[PDB]
Amino acid sequence: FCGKGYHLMSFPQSAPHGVVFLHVTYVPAHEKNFTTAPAICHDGKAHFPREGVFVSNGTHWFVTQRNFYEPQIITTDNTFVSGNCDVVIGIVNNTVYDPLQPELDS
Amino acid sequence: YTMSLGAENSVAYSNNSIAIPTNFTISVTTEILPVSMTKTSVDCTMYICG
Amino acid sequence: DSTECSNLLLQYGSFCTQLNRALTGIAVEQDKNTQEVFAQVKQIYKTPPIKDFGGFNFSQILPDPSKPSKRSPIEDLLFNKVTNGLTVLPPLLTDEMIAQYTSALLAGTITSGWTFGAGPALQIPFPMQMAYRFNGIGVTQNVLYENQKLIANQFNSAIGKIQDSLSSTP
Ligand SMILES: *[C@@H]1O[C@H](CO)[C@@H](O[C@@H]2O[C@H](CO)[C@@H](O)[C@H](O)[C@H]2NC(C)=O)[C@H](O)[C@H]1NC(C)=O
Ligand SMILES: *[C@@H]1O[C@H](CO)[C@@H](O[C@@H]2O[C@H](CO)[C@@H](O)[C@H](O)[C@H]2NC(C)=O)[C@H](O)[C@H]1NC(C)=O
Ligand SMILES: *[C@@H]1O[C@H](CO)[C@@H](O[C@@H]2O[C@H](CO)[C@@H](O)[C@H](O)[C@H]2NC(C)=O)[C@H](O)[C@H]1NC(C)=O
Ligand SMILES: *[C@@H]1O[C@H](CO)[C@@H](O[C@@H]2O[C@H](CO)[C@@H](O)[C@H](O)[C@H]2NC(C)=O)[C@H](O)[C@H]1NC(C)=O
Ligand SMILES: *[C@@H]1O[C@H](CO)[C@@H](O[C@@H]2O[C@H](CO)[C@@H](O)[C@H](O)[C@H]2NC(C)=O)[C@H](O)[C@H]1NC(C)=O
Ligand SMILES: *[C@@H]1O[C@H](CO)[C@@H](O)[C@H](O)[C@H]1NC(C)=O
């Protein structure tokens, strides 16, 4: 409706008997392949991303936002737990870091 | 010739692979919309008979 | 073919030119309408040869290789169910190309989600695309993943009901 791509903002310009809209949009570019999974199995529990998607670069698993590649460590802060690992089809095994663990470890 | 609808592109779909963008382009596009016309009035008596 | 009639008709001026121009405008408008509705993608996408979509069946909407027209069963049913100076201009886009455009749109929305409409087509698994759509309407991803078989069965049943309803209602 407001340009091709993900719409950010628009500018109006007057024209004889008309209006010209300059649509400023965000277009994704330079995409890269990653290996993906619906959920991460840790401690017999299934972890799902709160806002992102699980990606793998070949050996390590990360969670990133859907529209830009920004890999982050899979923690309890960006994932939520629902159910065990027996129901979700395609769940893979990976560790889930806990931020609270070094605090009581030390 | 018979027209070509578009360039062929086969998306590499698989059950466990995703494509994530690593960059972006800020694209500005133009949309031209007419708003009004010339306001014309015709004197019917003058036009038909003068 | 009456010359006297044409000679008398010339006294009335450019009425014929106005009528022909109006009809020409309507005729180009129809092609513009078809171009706006169907030609919204510049890449012709195709589905993968293996139809593994996590239990989701799209046979009724994907093109049938057996048919010469390369139409879907639903599209074939739709085409079957529709039945002095005059000339009929052919449409600029044939039925095969319109079917090809719908096929490209279906392949893009199945294999790439909504990414192809906003930029390059980025592949994503269909049970992840459905989870994204579930998140769009305010339902968590886990609900989609846990009940994937039931949702796929319901979707297939609904598509079959759509084909039966179209075939059974005049
Ligand atoms: C996937 O990304 C991870 C994170 O960067 C990579 O792990 C790093 O690998 C480099 C190169 O060997 C090391 O110097 C770093 O110490 C590693 N970091 C961690 C946290 O282990 C990993 O190698 C990448 N995998 C591939 C196949 O490229
Ligand atoms: C992911 O981890 C689970 C649990 O550790 C693995 O499930 C085990 O699989 C072995 C061999 O198939 C069985 O003997 C165990 O009884 C299973 N444990 C449970 C709790 O079910 C699973 O195989 C792992 N997956 C991968 C790909 O390594
Ligand atoms: C992700 O991987 C797939 C498969 O490895 C790539 O798809 C191939 O792309 C090349 C280059 O256009 C084609 O010649 C192959 O035929 C494609 N394979 C299939 C199965 O379609 C895809 O290009 C990769 N994505 C990126 C961004 O590089
Ligand atoms: C993302 O794309 C932009 C293009 O807009 C890249 O910026 C270019 O980078 C090259 C090499 O670093 C320069 O020669 C160009 O002049 C840059 N263009 C502009 C407009 O600044 C950017 O480097 C890309 N980033 C990544 C991570 O790929
Ligand atoms: C997808 O759905 C189609 C049609 O709903 C299935 O095709 C049917 O398969 C059964 C079993 O062989 C046949 O008895 C029917 O006659 C088929 N119907 C049609 C219209 O061809 C198909 O098996 C389903 N699954 C896949 C993976 O394509
Ligand atoms: C993808 O399909 C392969 C078979 O081609 C199967 O072994 C694998 O488990 C599947 N992965 C997912 C996440 O469905």
Short mmCIF file of C-alpha atoms and ligand atoms in Angstrom, two decimals:
data_model
loop_
_atom_site.label_atom_id
_atom_site.label_comp_id
_atom_site.label_asym_id
_atom_site.label_seq_id
_atom_site.Cartn_x
_atom_site.Cartn_y
_atom_site.Cartn_z
CA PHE A 1 0.00 0.00 0.00
CA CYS A 2 2.87 2.40 0.78
CA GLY A 3 5.63 1.21 -1.54
CA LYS A 4 7.36 -2.04 -2.39
CA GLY A 5 9.08 -3.53 0.64
CA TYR A 6 8.57 -3.16 4.36
CA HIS A 7 7.19 0.35 4.71
CA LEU A 8 9.07 2.78 6.95
CA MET A 9 7.70 6.25 6.16
CA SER A 10 6.38 8.45 3.35
CA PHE A 11 6.78 12.00 2.08
CA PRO A 12 4.10 14.03 0.25
CA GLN A 13 5.00 16.24 -2.71
CA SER A 14 2.62 18.57 -4.52
CA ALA A 15 2.19 18.09 -8.27
CA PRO A 16 -0.04 19.82 -10.86
CA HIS A 17 -3.50 18.31 -10.28
CA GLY A 18 -1.95 15.58 -8.15
CA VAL A 19 0.20 14.27 -5.35
CA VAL A 20 3.47 12.31 -5.49
CA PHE A 21 4.30 10.05 -2.56
CA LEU A 22 7.93 9.22 -1.88
CA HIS A 23 7.72 5.90 -0.05
CA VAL A 24 10.78 5.12 2.06
CA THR A 25 10.86 1.35 2.60
CA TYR A 26 13.23 -1.25 4.04
CA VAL A 27 14.31 -4.01 1.64
CA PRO A 28 16.23 -7.04 2.98
CA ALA A 29 19.43 -7.88 1.12
CA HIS A 30 22.46 -10.20 1.19
CA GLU A 31 20.58 -13.20 2.58
CA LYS A 32 22.45 -16.22 3.90
CA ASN A 33 21.43 -19.86 4.40
CA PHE A 34 21.18 -21.33 7.89
CA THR A 35 20.02 -24.65 9.31
CA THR A 36 16.85 -24.14 11.32
CA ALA A 37 14.81 -26.05 13.89
CA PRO A 38 11.39 -25.37 15.47
CA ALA A 39 12.59 -25.86 19.06
CA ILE A 40 15.64 -26.64 21.20
CA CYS A 41 15.57 -29.68 23.49
CA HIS A 42 17.31 -29.07 26.82
CA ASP A 43 16.87 -30.98 30.11
CA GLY A 44 13.87 -32.82 28.70
CA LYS A 45 12.10 -29.52 27.96
CA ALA A 46 11.30 -27.78 24.68
CA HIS A 47 12.48 -24.18 24.26
CA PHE A 48 10.89 -21.85 21.71
CA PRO A 49 12.07 -18.34 20.72
CA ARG A 50 10.25 -15.44 22.33
CA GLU A 51 10.65 -13.14 19.33
CA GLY A 52 13.24 -14.67 17.00
CA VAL A 53 14.19 -17.88 15.20
CA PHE A 54 16.76 -20.61 15.86
CA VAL A 55 19.56 -20.73 13.29
CA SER A 56 22.69 -22.82 12.93
CA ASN A 57 25.83 -21.93 10.98
CA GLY A 58 26.84 -25.59 10.84
CA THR A 59 28.08 -26.51 14.31
CA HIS A 60 26.61 -24.01 16.78
CA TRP A 61 23.02 -22.95 17.47
CA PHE A 62 21.94 -19.34 17.99
CA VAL A 63 18.74 -17.30 18.11
CA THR A 64 18.33 -14.27 15.85
CA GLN A 65 15.68 -11.76 14.88
CA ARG A 66 13.70 -12.82 11.82
CA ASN A 67 14.38 -9.82 9.58
CA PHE A 68 18.11 -9.28 10.23
CA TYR A 69 20.98 -11.64 11.00
CA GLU A 70 22.14 -10.94 14.56
CA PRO A 71 23.15 -14.23 16.22
CA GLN A 72 22.84 -14.37 20.00
CA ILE A 73 23.48 -17.12 22.53
CA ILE A 74 20.43 -19.25 23.31
CA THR A 75 19.51 -18.38 26.91
CA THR A 76 16.47 -18.57 29.16
CA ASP A 77 15.91 -14.82 28.65
CA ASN A 78 15.06 -15.06 24.94
CA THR A 79 13.30 -18.45 24.99
CA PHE A 80 10.21 -19.83 26.71
CA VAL A 81 9.51 -23.40 27.81
CA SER A 82 6.34 -25.26 26.82
CA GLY A 83 6.12 -29.03 27.23
CA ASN A 84 8.69 -31.76 26.78
CA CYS A 85 10.67 -32.79 23.69
CA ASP A 86 8.41 -35.69 22.67
CA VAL A 87 5.67 -33.72 20.89
CA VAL A 88 7.41 -31.17 18.64
CA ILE A 89 8.38 -32.60 15.25
CA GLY A 90 11.94 -31.76 14.27
CA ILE A 91 13.28 -30.66 17.67
CA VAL A 92 17.08 -30.79 17.95
CA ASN A 93 19.36 -31.15 20.96
CA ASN A 94 21.37 -28.15 22.12
CA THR A 95 22.34 -26.53 25.40
CA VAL A 96 20.48 -23.53 26.81
CA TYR A 97 22.63 -21.11 28.80
CA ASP A 98 21.42 -19.70 32.11
CA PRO A 99 22.49 -16.17 33.16
CA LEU A 100 21.85 -16.99 36.83
CA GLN A 101 24.28 -19.95 36.80
CA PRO A 102 27.62 -18.03 37.19
CA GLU A 103 26.11 -15.92 40.00
CA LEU A 104 25.49 -18.87 42.31
CA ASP A 105 28.46 -20.78 40.87
CA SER A 106 30.85 -18.10 42.16
CA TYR B 1 7.19 -12.95 -29.63
CA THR B 2 5.31 -14.57 -26.79
CA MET B 3 5.95 -12.56 -23.65
CA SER B 4 7.98 -13.83 -20.71
CA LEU B 5 6.14 -13.34 -17.43
CA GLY B 6 9.27 -13.10 -15.31
CA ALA B 7 12.79 -14.36 -14.82
CA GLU B 8 12.81 -17.92 -13.53
CA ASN B 9 13.64 -18.33 -9.85
CA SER B 10 13.42 -21.65 -8.01
CA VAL B 11 13.39 -21.15 -4.25
CA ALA B 12 15.55 -23.79 -2.54
CA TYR B 13 12.87 -25.06 -0.19
CA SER B 14 13.77 -27.75 2.32
CA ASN B 15 12.23 -28.79 5.61
CA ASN B 16 15.12 -27.57 7.79
CA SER B 17 16.78 -24.60 6.03
CA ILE B 18 16.00 -20.90 6.43
CA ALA B 19 17.37 -17.78 4.75
CA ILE B 20 18.14 -14.80 6.99
CA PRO B 21 19.00 -11.32 5.63
CA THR B 22 22.40 -9.98 6.63
CA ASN B 23 21.99 -6.46 5.18
CA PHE B 24 19.39 -3.97 4.03
CA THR B 25 18.66 -1.37 1.37
CA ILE B 26 16.72 1.83 2.04
CA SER B 27 14.58 2.13 -1.09
CA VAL B 28 12.55 5.21 -2.02
CA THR B 29 9.83 4.73 -4.63
CA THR B 30 7.49 7.19 -6.34
CA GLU B 31 3.70 6.94 -6.48
CA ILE B 32 1.82 9.49 -8.61
CA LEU B 33 -1.89 9.94 -7.91
CA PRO B 34 -4.24 12.42 -9.62
CA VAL B 35 -6.32 14.44 -7.16
CA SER B 36 -8.35 17.01 -9.11
CA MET B 37 -9.23 18.09 -12.64
CA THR B 38 -9.67 21.44 -14.32
CA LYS B 39 -12.91 23.06 -13.16
CA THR B 40 -14.91 23.73 -16.33
CA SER B 41 -18.26 25.50 -16.67
CA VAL B 42 -20.24 25.73 -19.90
CA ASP B 43 -22.91 28.34 -20.60
CA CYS B 44 -25.55 26.11 -22.22
CA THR B 45 -27.50 28.95 -23.86
CA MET B 46 -24.35 30.64 -25.19
CA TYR B 47 -22.87 27.35 -26.42
CA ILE B 48 -25.96 26.17 -28.28
CA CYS B 49 -27.25 29.52 -29.55
CA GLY B 50 -24.81 32.37 -28.82
CA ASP C 1 -22.01 -0.51 -46.69
CA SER C 2 -24.39 2.31 -47.70
CA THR C 3 -22.40 5.26 -49.06
CA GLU C 4 -25.36 7.67 -48.76
CA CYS C 5 -25.81 6.77 -45.09
CA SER C 6 -22.12 7.42 -44.38
CA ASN C 7 -22.33 10.74 -46.24
CA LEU C 8 -25.28 11.77 -44.08
CA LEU C 9 -23.50 10.44 -40.97
CA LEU C 10 -20.50 12.70 -41.65
CA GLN C 11 -22.76 15.73 -41.01
CA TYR C 12 -22.91 14.76 -37.31
CA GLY C 13 -19.15 15.19 -36.86
CA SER C 14 -16.87 13.24 -34.53
CA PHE C 15 -19.41 11.17 -32.57
CA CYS C 16 -17.97 7.94 -34.00
CA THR C 17 -14.43 8.94 -32.98
CA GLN C 18 -15.59 9.59 -29.41
CA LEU C 19 -17.38 6.23 -29.19
CA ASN C 20 -14.39 4.33 -30.63
CA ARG C 21 -11.98 6.13 -28.29
CA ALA C 22 -14.17 5.35 -25.26
CA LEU C 23 -14.37 1.67 -26.20
CA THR C 24 -10.60 1.58 -26.78
CA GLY C 25 -10.09 3.10 -23.33
CA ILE C 26 -12.31 0.42 -21.78
CA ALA C 27 -10.42 -2.29 -23.70
CA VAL C 28 -7.00 -1.12 -22.49
CA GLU C 29 -8.49 -0.66 -18.99
CA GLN C 30 -9.39 -4.37 -18.83
CA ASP C 31 -5.80 -5.37 -19.65
CA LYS C 32 -4.55 -2.87 -17.06
CA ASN C 33 -6.91 -4.40 -14.49
CA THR C 34 -5.59 -7.91 -15.18
CA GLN C 35 -2.00 -6.62 -15.04
CA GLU C 36 -2.58 -4.93 -11.67
CA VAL C 37 -4.34 -7.93 -10.12
CA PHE C 38 -2.16 -10.83 -11.27
CA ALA C 39 1.25 -9.44 -12.32
CA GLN C 40 2.45 -8.48 -8.84
CA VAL C 41 5.68 -10.53 -8.97
CA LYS C 42 8.58 -10.31 -11.41
CA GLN C 43 10.05 -13.72 -10.50
CA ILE C 44 8.30 -16.92 -11.56
CA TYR C 45 8.61 -19.17 -8.51
CA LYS C 46 8.21 -22.94 -8.53
CA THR C 47 7.57 -25.43 -5.78
CA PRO C 48 10.22 -28.06 -4.97
CA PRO C 49 9.76 -31.48 -6.63
CA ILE C 50 9.31 -33.13 -3.21
CA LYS C 51 6.06 -31.91 -1.63
CA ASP C 52 7.22 -32.25 1.98
CA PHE C 53 5.49 -29.37 3.77
CA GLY C 54 5.21 -30.84 7.26
CA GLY C 55 1.91 -32.61 6.59
CA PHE C 56 0.27 -29.78 4.65
CA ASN C 57 -1.25 -30.83 1.32
CA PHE C 58 -1.53 -28.31 -1.53
CA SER C 59 -2.46 -30.66 -4.41
CA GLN C 60 -5.86 -29.04 -4.98
CA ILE C 61 -4.30 -25.58 -5.46
CA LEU C 62 -0.94 -26.38 -7.07
CA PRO C 63 -0.83 -26.91 -10.86
CA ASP C 64 -1.55 -30.42 -12.10
CA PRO C 65 1.25 -31.80 -14.33
CA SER C 66 -1.21 -34.25 -15.94
CA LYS C 67 -3.38 -31.47 -17.36
CA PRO C 68 -2.24 -29.76 -20.60
CA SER C 69 -3.42 -26.35 -19.34
CA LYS C 70 -1.14 -26.59 -16.23
CA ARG C 71 -4.05 -25.55 -14.01
CA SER C 72 -4.93 -26.63 -10.50
CA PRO C 73 -7.94 -28.92 -9.92
CA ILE C 74 -9.74 -25.98 -8.30
CA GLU C 75 -8.83 -23.71 -11.24
CA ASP C 76 -9.92 -26.39 -13.71
CA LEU C 77 -13.25 -26.69 -11.88
CA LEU C 78 -13.66 -22.89 -11.96
CA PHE C 79 -13.01 -22.79 -15.71
CA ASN C 80 -15.47 -25.63 -16.29
CA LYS C 81 -18.20 -23.98 -14.21
CA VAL C 82 -18.16 -20.69 -16.18
CA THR C 83 -20.03 -20.87 -19.49
CA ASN C 84 -22.55 -5.63 -37.68
CA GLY C 85 -19.33 -3.87 -36.71
CA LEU C 86 -18.79 -5.94 -33.56
CA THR C 87 -15.32 -7.28 -32.79
CA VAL C 88 -13.99 -8.98 -29.67
CA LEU C 89 -10.39 -8.21 -28.87
CA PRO C 90 -8.49 -11.05 -27.16
CA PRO C 91 -7.15 -10.42 -23.65
CA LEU C 92 -3.48 -9.50 -23.49
CA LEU C 93 -2.79 -12.19 -20.89
CA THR C 94 -3.97 -15.66 -21.84
CA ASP C 95 -5.54 -18.04 -19.32
CA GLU C 96 -2.34 -20.10 -19.23
CA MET C 97 -0.22 -17.08 -18.24
CA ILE C 98 -2.74 -16.00 -15.59
CA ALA C 99 -2.61 -19.56 -14.23
CA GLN C 100 1.20 -19.33 -14.32
CA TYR C 101 1.08 -16.06 -12.35
CA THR C 102 -1.17 -17.67 -9.73
CA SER C 103 1.25 -20.63 -9.64
CA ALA C 104 4.17 -18.25 -9.04
CA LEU C 105 2.27 -16.47 -6.26
CA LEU C 106 1.35 -19.81 -4.65
CA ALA C 107 4.95 -21.04 -4.84
CA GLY C 108 6.21 -17.80 -3.32
CA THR C 109 3.69 -17.81 -0.47
CA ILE C 110 4.30 -21.51 0.26
CA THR C 111 8.09 -21.66 0.06
CA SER C 112 9.05 -18.11 1.07
CA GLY C 113 6.23 -16.77 3.27
CA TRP C 114 5.65 -13.05 2.90
CA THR C 115 9.33 -12.33 2.20
CA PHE C 116 8.95 -12.48 -1.60
CA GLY C 117 6.33 -9.72 -1.54
CA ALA C 118 8.67 -7.33 0.28
CA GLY C 119 12.00 -8.20 -1.35
CA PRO C 120 14.01 -11.29 -2.25
CA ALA C 121 12.35 -14.64 -1.69
CA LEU C 122 13.82 -16.11 1.50
CA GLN C 123 13.15 -19.81 2.03
CA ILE C 124 11.56 -20.91 5.30
CA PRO C 125 9.99 -24.27 6.26
CA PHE C 126 6.20 -24.23 6.05
CA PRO C 127 5.61 -25.29 9.72
CA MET C 128 7.78 -22.30 10.68
CA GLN C 129 5.88 -19.99 8.32
CA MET C 130 2.62 -21.12 9.90
CA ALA C 131 4.10 -20.49 13.36
CA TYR C 132 5.02 -16.95 12.26
CA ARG C 133 1.44 -16.44 11.07
CA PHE C 134 0.20 -17.81 14.41
CA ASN C 135 2.40 -15.24 16.17
CA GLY C 136 0.87 -12.58 13.94
CA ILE C 137 -2.62 -13.27 15.31
CA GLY C 138 -1.40 -13.44 18.92
CA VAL C 139 -1.02 -17.21 19.41
CA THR C 140 2.29 -18.63 20.65
CA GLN C 141 4.50 -20.81 18.43
CA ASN C 142 4.25 -23.82 20.78
CA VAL C 143 0.51 -24.17 20.07
CA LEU C 144 1.25 -24.55 16.35
CA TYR C 145 4.19 -26.94 16.83
CA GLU C 146 2.49 -29.24 19.35
CA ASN C 147 -0.72 -29.52 17.28
CA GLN C 148 0.91 -29.56 13.82
CA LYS C 149 -0.74 -32.83 12.71
CA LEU C 150 -4.23 -31.66 13.73
CA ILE C 151 -3.83 -28.30 11.98
CA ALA C 152 -2.54 -29.98 8.81
CA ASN C 153 -5.47 -32.42 8.85
CA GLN C 154 -7.96 -29.58 9.40
CA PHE C 155 -6.40 -27.53 6.58
CA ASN C 156 -6.55 -30.47 4.15
CA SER C 157 -10.16 -31.21 5.16
CA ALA C 158 -11.13 -27.56 4.65
CA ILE C 159 -9.49 -27.47 1.20
CA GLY C 160 -11.39 -30.62 0.24
CA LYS C 161 -14.63 -29.11 1.53
CA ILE C 162 -13.93 -26.00 -0.57
CA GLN C 163 -13.53 -28.10 -3.73
CA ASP C 164 -16.68 -30.12 -2.95
CA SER C 165 -18.67 -26.94 -2.21
CA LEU C 166 -17.58 -25.33 -5.48
CA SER C 167 -18.36 -28.52 -7.42
CA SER C 168 -21.77 -28.96 -5.77
CA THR C 169 -23.15 -25.40 -5.87
CA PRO C 170 -24.28 -23.87 -9.20
C1 LIG D 1 29.56 -20.73 14.02
O1 LIG D 1 29.70 -19.54 14.83
C2 LIG D 1 30.45 -19.77 16.03
C3 LIG D 1 30.41 -18.48 16.82
O2 LIG D 1 31.28 -17.51 16.26
C4 LIG D 1 31.86 -20.22 15.66
O3 LIG D 1 32.61 -20.49 16.84
C5 LIG D 1 33.85 -19.73 16.85
O4 LIG D 1 34.82 -20.25 15.92
C6 LIG D 1 35.99 -19.43 15.87
C7 LIG D 1 36.86 -19.97 14.76
O5 LIG D 1 37.31 -21.29 15.06
C8 LIG D 1 36.68 -19.44 17.24
O6 LIG D 1 37.82 -18.60 17.20
C9 LIG D 1 35.71 -18.95 18.31
O7 LIG D 1 36.30 -19.08 19.60
C10 LIG D 1 34.42 -19.77 18.26
N1 LIG D 1 33.46 -19.28 19.23
C11 LIG D 1 32.79 -20.07 20.07
C12 LIG D 1 31.84 -19.39 21.01
O8 LIG D 1 32.95 -21.29 20.07
C13 LIG D 1 31.78 -21.49 14.82
O9 LIG D 1 33.08 -21.90 14.42
C14 LIG D 1 30.93 -21.22 13.58
N2 LIG D 1 30.83 -22.41 12.76
C15 LIG D 1 31.19 -22.45 11.47
C16 LIG D 1 31.03 -23.76 10.78
O10 LIG D 1 31.64 -21.46 10.90
C1 LIG D 2 18.46 -35.88 22.06
O1 LIG D 2 18.50 -36.21 23.47
C2 LIG D 2 17.53 -37.20 23.83
C3 LIG D 2 17.61 -37.34 25.34
O2 LIG D 2 18.95 -37.33 25.79
C4 LIG D 2 17.84 -38.50 23.08
O3 LIG D 2 16.86 -39.49 23.41
C5 LIG D 2 17.51 -40.71 23.84
O4 LIG D 2 17.86 -41.55 22.71
C6 LIG D 2 18.55 -42.75 23.10
C7 LIG D 2 18.94 -43.46 21.83
O5 LIG D 2 17.96 -43.28 20.81
C8 LIG D 2 17.64 -43.59 24.00
O6 LIG D 2 18.33 -44.76 24.42
C9 LIG D 2 17.22 -42.77 25.22
O7 LIG D 2 16.31 -43.51 26.01
C10 LIG D 2 16.56 -41.47 24.76
N1 LIG D 2 16.19 -40.65 25.91
C11 LIG D 2 14.98 -40.11 26.06
C12 LIG D 2 14.77 -39.31 27.31
O8 LIG D 2 14.09 -40.27 25.23
C13 LIG D 2 17.81 -38.23 21.58
O9 LIG D 2 18.16 -39.40 20.86
C14 LIG D 2 18.81 -37.12 21.25
N2 LIG D 2 18.80 -36.83 19.83
C15 LIG D 2 19.91 -36.71 19.10
C16 LIG D 2 19.72 -36.41 17.64
O10 LIG D 2 21.03 -36.83 19.60
C1 LIG D 3 21.07 -21.92 -0.09
O1 LIG D 3 21.40 -23.24 -0.55
C2 LIG D 3 20.72 -23.63 -1.75
C3 LIG D 3 21.13 -25.06 -2.03
O2 LIG D 3 22.49 -25.29 -1.70
C4 LIG D 3 21.08 -22.66 -2.89
O3 LIG D 3 20.29 -22.99 -4.02
C5 LIG D 3 21.09 -23.19 -5.20
O4 LIG D 3 21.49 -21.95 -5.82
C6 LIG D 3 22.32 -22.14 -6.98
C7 LIG D 3 22.74 -20.77 -7.45
O5 LIG D 3 21.63 -20.04 -7.96
C8 LIG D 3 21.55 -22.93 -8.04
O6 LIG D 3 22.39 -23.15 -9.17
C9 LIG D 3 21.09 -24.26 -7.45
O7 LIG D 3 20.31 -24.97 -8.40
C10 LIG D 3 20.27 -24.01 -6.19
N1 LIG D 3 19.84 -25.27 -5.60
C11 LIG D 3 18.55 -25.63 -5.51
C12 LIG D 3 18.29 -26.96 -4.87
O8 LIG D 3 17.65 -24.91 -5.91
C13 LIG D 3 20.78 -21.23 -2.47
O9 LIG D 3 21.21 -20.32 -3.47
C14 LIG D 3 21.47 -20.90 -1.15
N2 LIG D 3 21.15 -19.55 -0.72
C15 LIG D 3 22.02 -18.54 -0.79
C16 LIG D 3 21.52 -17.21 -0.32
O10 LIG D 3 23.16 -18.69 -1.22
C1 LIG D 4 25.73 -3.73 3.61
O1 LIG D 4 25.51 -3.07 2.35
C2 LIG D 4 26.12 -1.76 2.29
C3 LIG D 4 25.70 -1.16 0.96
O2 LIG D 4 24.72 -0.15 1.14
C4 LIG D 4 27.63 -1.92 2.44
O3 LIG D 4 28.26 -0.64 2.41
C5 LIG D 4 29.29 -0.61 1.40
O4 LIG D 4 30.51 -1.26 1.83
C6 LIG D 4 31.51 -1.29 0.80
C7 LIG D 4 32.66 -2.10 1.34
O5 LIG D 4 32.72 -2.04 2.76
C8 LIG D 4 31.90 0.14 0.43
O6 LIG D 4 32.87 0.11 -0.61
C9 LIG D 4 30.66 0.90 -0.03
O7 LIG D 4 31.00 2.26 -0.30
C10 LIG D 4 29.58 0.85 1.05
N1 LIG D 4 28.38 1.54 0.61
C11 LIG D 4 27.77 2.47 1.34
C12 LIG D 4 26.54 3.08 0.74
O8 LIG D 4 28.19 2.82 2.44
C13 LIG D 4 27.93 -2.61 3.77
O9 LIG D 4 29.33 -2.81 3.92
C14 LIG D 4 27.22 -3.96 3.81
N2 LIG D 4 27.48 -4.63 5.07
C15 LIG D 4 27.62 -5.95 5.18
C16 LIG D 4 27.88 -6.47 6.56
O10 LIG D 4 27.54 -6.69 4.21
C1 LIG D 5 -2.57 -34.89 -1.02
O1 LIG D 5 -3.95 -34.85 -1.42
C2 LIG D 5 -4.21 -35.57 -2.63
C3 LIG D 5 -5.65 -35.29 -2.99
O2 LIG D 5 -6.39 -34.87 -1.86
C4 LIG D 5 -3.91 -37.05 -2.40
O3 LIG D 5 -4.16 -37.79 -3.59
C5 LIG D 5 -5.05 -38.89 -3.31
O4 LIG D 5 -4.33 -40.08 -2.90
C6 LIG D 5 -5.18 -41.19 -2.58
C7 LIG D 5 -4.28 -42.30 -2.09
O5 LIG D 5 -3.45 -42.80 -3.13
C8 LIG D 5 -5.99 -41.58 -3.82
O6 LIG D 5 -6.86 -42.66 -3.50
C9 LIG D 5 -6.80 -40.38 -4.30
O7 LIG D 5 -7.50 -40.71 -5.50
C10 LIG D 5 -5.87 -39.20 -4.57
N1 LIG D 5 -6.63 -38.04 -4.99
C11 LIG D 5 -6.27 -37.27 -6.02
C12 LIG D 5 -7.17 -36.11 -6.33
O8 LIG D 5 -5.25 -37.49 -6.68
C13 LIG D 5 -2.45 -37.21 -1.98
O9 LIG D 5 -2.16 -38.57 -1.69
C14 LIG D 5 -2.16 -36.34 -0.75
N2 LIG D 5 -0.78 -36.48 -0.31
C15 LIG D 5 0.34 -36.13 -0.99
C16 LIG D 5 1.63 -36.39 -0.27
O10 LIG D 5 0.31 -35.64 -2.12
C1 LIG D 6 13.47 -33.36 7.02
O1 LIG D 6 13.32 -34.50 6.13
C2 LIG D 6 14.30 -35.53 6.36
C3 LIG D 6 14.09 -36.57 5.28
O2 LIG D 6 14.31 -36.02 3.99
C4 LIG D 6 14.12 -36.08 7.77
O3 LIG D 6 15.07 -37.11 8.00
C5 LIG D 6 14.31 -34.95 8.77
O4 LIG D 6 14.10 -35.43 10.09
C6 LIG D 6 13.33 -33.82 8.47
N1 LIG D 6 13.54 -32.71 9.38
C7 LIG D 6 12.55 -31.98 9.90
C8 LIG D 6 12.96 -30.86 10.81
O5 LIG D 6 11.37 -32.20 9.63
#
